[model samples]
Target: QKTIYLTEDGVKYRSIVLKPGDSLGQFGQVYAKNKIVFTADDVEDKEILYVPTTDKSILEYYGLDAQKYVIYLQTLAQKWNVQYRDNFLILEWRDGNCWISSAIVLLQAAKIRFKGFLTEAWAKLLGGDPTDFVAWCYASCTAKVGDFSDANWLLANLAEHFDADYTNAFLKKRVSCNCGIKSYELRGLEACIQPVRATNLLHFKTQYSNCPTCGANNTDEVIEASLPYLLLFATDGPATVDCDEDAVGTVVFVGSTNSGHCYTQAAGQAFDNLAKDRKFGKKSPYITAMYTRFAFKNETS
Candidate 1:
């Protein structure tokens, strides 16, 4: 086993420190630009990422085949938190500086375009647009924050990382009561400005009991019977339940769910109801809540 040391190149601190697992490099190994260099070890590059320009350039300038030594570039680049800009890579700096250049290192994975056995080529060489890669990546990572390399770093401070401590209010960071409920309270609250986040029927039934406002033996009955009202509130933001906004205690409800599981259940049911009510088809928006209703139940109780 080789000893891996954690050191910084001083350009990017947060990148090196915050990247998830970092356990091994490469995010699924699709190739640096889709070329397959069969060395039998895509995983090796992940262990230590290096940037190609600095070290390998020096070697090429001195008249040598830089490919073998180019492996070292992966190590340096990862240490500095280099983000890929196509064939080019950008070095992210703590002080907001960047070193941009073309890189010639083995990508973490290999992509093959199969026409026939003899006509096999990589994703790029066979005209596989890089944008597809980018789009697929963005959709996957943005929707599921933990999937991409950068998102894992950005969401590192998010409550989901530690103990599922969704209510700690520090990592989760409670917003003011006026703005609305916190994201940790649900899963899809725009990070801020979200309210009335969706939760599970059963789990929410549990929270309904703890709510001093709702009497016992009437929680699930309240949620189930009032599902339409909840959908109404979700669509229209809020309703004038007791009185108008200027009348009595007017409450505004901005809906977003942080509970993945509950949000799935409620949003799924909501869409089904919406489809039946409006005669729409099966297509629906992706639910963004989570399975964390139990934590809130524990907290309130």
Candidate 2:
């Protein structure tokens, strides 16, 4: 019997060899549109996975125990006010101008379940390597909001799960700014800067702490600060509301309403309409990606 592999990108995949009694039809149709065929004897012995490409519900049509892993993620998608389409989780803000892949939701679940990292078995089921999976996530994230890069979101999530210090080092070693400059140097140059000391996950402020680099006064509101990184952070207490009616620009922060229960947009739309319209050309309340030191324990700003 031949085995079929289901995937999103149609390129990177895992091979689940069908056993003697395992029927491909049990999973779904064995037709041309769903076909990416391989024989057990071809690779001799290897792992393979299958998930349908059709518009059908992957959980309803194809049966798997692991589908349960995504339920919490579904709830998260709603709480964050983002869209979960097919296997992809998308974040769109500012008239769909700013966006991110947000595929880490699944991988994060896997990490907690499978012990800190995705196992090969789970990786096979996910339809791609963890490394490649991140590539797919990055390919989907773009620079549409403010000066923030996709790395801000990626590293922030990684820091959430793993060691913030280590993830910060990893991001510093690997990721770069959109301007082709050192990412750390531009950390506070735009958006909200996640200072090393703040106990929260996200931050937004109108004024860049150090005005000398930008050649502005401490009182001058920085436009990019209002638009920093969107949707990924946790706080022990209720989020601070600094963007008052007199405030301008925008900022998005994720914080907790209860002791342990965390939620996104607990205080959504941190903006000062009067201050915002007076400072920037565009008046729409929006966010820019906030870049914080991945591992900084003390506040930089």
Candidate 3:
């Protein structure tokens, strides 16, 4: 029999590759009913791994307790042909004016992204990547709002994630990086964005601190910026909203209660009043694909 499997954008997929939303019936019809889907505890952790040819532990991992279940590359090579790669990576999910990149999985939100914002908060976050701080933050906020009456109203007071400041240096010295917005996964975003340390300017750089509009600590660099790389939206185009009411004019510019970047499938829905109004004109939000950087400023302003 042939084998059928599915993989998300990032590696580290399961052997029985079907995710929650997938339809097994449609999958069988499309790939053919004569296919074997594999899944195992060991295989789930190994990313982009080769289909097990003769590895006993993993093969046994797949064939837990079975006389009928056999996992060998030979069976697949002959019947399934050589698409022999065991995992899949989601490069991008292109929606109108909005897109999701492989970074979704890389940032460990591929599965949880569908779990609805602020709804199944704990289950998705805790069940997600253990080290995911953003998930933890959201969940933490949830726990803090223990009162059931505060649940629905709490969405308004949420803090926006963070912006990914970047630039061509081609862009500038002082820029804002609002996290958790659309258009993510800049491979070199880390190398590009550096927080202002105590003040990294002498003359032209002129590190501006305590930006009343942007909120940089006057005496120190961005405290929130010291954490690991953020996993925000990756918009290759102009998809944006103002997620952080506190900060504005950011590339992934969705605000906290805007209802754009907060939900699992509302990137397009975010293209509502604020998104449409901000899409263009003299001064609007942007993803800054050409160039952008963090915390340095031009003397002109």
Candidate 4:
């Protein structure tokens, strides 16, 4: 057994105790981006861990990896012959930013060609264009925020060292009202904007639930919504949501989060890999909303 000291290059620790079970992959998944070398562990770098970049830059953020989506299409072709895969892997590596770069290749999961994807990716984004968002990120973080490795600041915070109390405090500073909704309340609202920005830069002046007491639009600001909320709202009466195999041209919204993976643990703000599909567990950072409905049979209810 090895002791793992909690600190960054030797610093303030929340706590470091011992209790055992699947220490390495304690969580459903793991990533080295947020791991510290630890004091008791025998390692050389020992500089502690925190990704300055995100999966976004796995290819290149400073510039474009013209071959970003190109390679994903290539690799799946080779392994399709094996038919022994649970997840798809691509050769295009993020120089270090999975928050951005890895997500690019994850689109490999979409199983679409570059040309078609280029045109159609915008089509399904609800209403936004990721291309425009990418350009804005390139300029916003790269140009304006200057050193915001990830143009999306909220997500960058998620990739940093983990904590318990500080996470809520960090977001609390951004809150202004009290509608009883806790945390960032990232439920649904991804399509109202250009498209992916709501999913990408979700924290920017977020749209949330409205307030009950003060009547401020703080906690219940359901502009766009997630499926859970939508289904619940429909419970009031007369609405049908079908996730059947057949569908037609329609628009909906969405939101995103770093999906707090190690929030309870003293671990730093380590999130799940973009490719992993884990549950939001308890108190994971989320930002969702739903549109207002006028067809309530009982309006005063």
The lDDT for every candidate, in the order shown, is 0.23, 0.29, 0.26, 0.25
Ranking by TM-score: 2, 4, 3, 1
Candidate 2, position 271, lDDT: 23
Evaluated with TM-score, which candidate comes out highest?
Answer: 2
Candidate 4: what lDDT? 0.25
Model 3, residue 54: distance off in Å is: 17
Tens digits of per-residue lDDT, candidate 1, 227-254, equal: 1011111222222222211111111222
Between candidates 1 and 2, the one scoring higher on lDDT is: 2
Q: Which 10 consecutive positions of candidate 3 have the poorest summed lDDT? A: 77-86
lDDT of 3 by residue, 38-152 (tens): 4332222222323222335533433222211122221221111111011312221222112122112222221222222322432333343211222222233332211111111
**In candidate 4, how many Å is residue 245 off?**
18
| Candidate 4: stretches off by over 4 Å | 1-85, 90-94, 105-148, 151-191, 194-220, 223-300
Determine the C-alpha RMSD for candidate 4 after optimal superposition of all C-alphas: 19.6
Candidate 2 TM-score, true structure as reference: 0.25
Q: For each candidate, C-alpha RMSD in Å?
A: 20.1, 16.4, 17.3, 19.6
